Amino acid sequence: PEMVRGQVFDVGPRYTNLSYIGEGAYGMVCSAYDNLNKVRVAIKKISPFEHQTYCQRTLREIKILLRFRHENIIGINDIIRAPTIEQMKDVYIVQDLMETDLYKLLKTQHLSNDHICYFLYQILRGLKYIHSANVLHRDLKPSNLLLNTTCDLKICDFGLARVALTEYVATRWYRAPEIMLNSKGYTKSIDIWSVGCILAEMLSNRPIFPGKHYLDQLNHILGILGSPSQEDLNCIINLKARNYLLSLPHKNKVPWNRLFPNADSKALDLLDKMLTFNPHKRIEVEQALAHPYLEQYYDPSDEPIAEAPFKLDDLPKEKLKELIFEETARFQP
């Protein structure tokens, strides 16, 4: 059995010639040669059965990705795990190999307006399918937008997706303000906010709302958007959250063209509509795709939706391990 950076990868004999790619907060990813299909693939190793939250992430990602089929969403080609549930301690998820991700790209190069337009289009085209299935991704960020040399884009990492929060995550910089204000009742609009953050980061190679915690992040958001209007304060129903906002000093709105003086004015108009504090007035995915900035790509005859919308948190880790064993049985010889 081959080892990569000290960790075992028991994926043979089908997959061989491993090479380290990277790691998130929950899995180690390598590339490998698929001796059946005669191409190189990506393989993510997960060891989730010790913790409630790990099991949930694994079961959610597998159940969703096995049922999604879309050009801008990563697929699962295979799943490897032990033939018995007692020997099952790792899961290996096999996917199409991509070359990089938007996080790593933005650390290395400027994006032209043409790049930004095409990437944004693909993010929203994928999100149009996800939302048509009544699913929220809930964790869109540059590191889970996979890319290849021809600028094809695929959304990945569905471990936090839910059908329409305390766990550890690598970054909270893309979360909507209504999550930070404990408004609860989150909608598809939280995904649009994240796309707004990603668009801003493509324009400047810098995260727009960094912060060391939600209080700091909210100050960054309010330092750009300005203090919320009276009408915006009414969308914050939580007693303490609304009082907190009222306790803050007034902050003026910063024009988008001052923060991004070289950006396409059409890109800034769409950015303004995605980074709307009020989630009910935030632009929806279909209206975003129809925005003038994306006019050269908007093509509703070539933007598929889910044929049917989808319709666990109280289960112990042993029961979740059973369900994981069950959803993965189809890939056993």
Partner: peptide, 14 residues
């Protein structure tokens, strides 16, 4: 998408 719709190749490096 670009290739299917007959648009010129858009490379990351440009």
């Amino acid at each position: 998408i670009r290739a299917r719709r007959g648009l010129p190749r858009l490379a990351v490096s440009d």
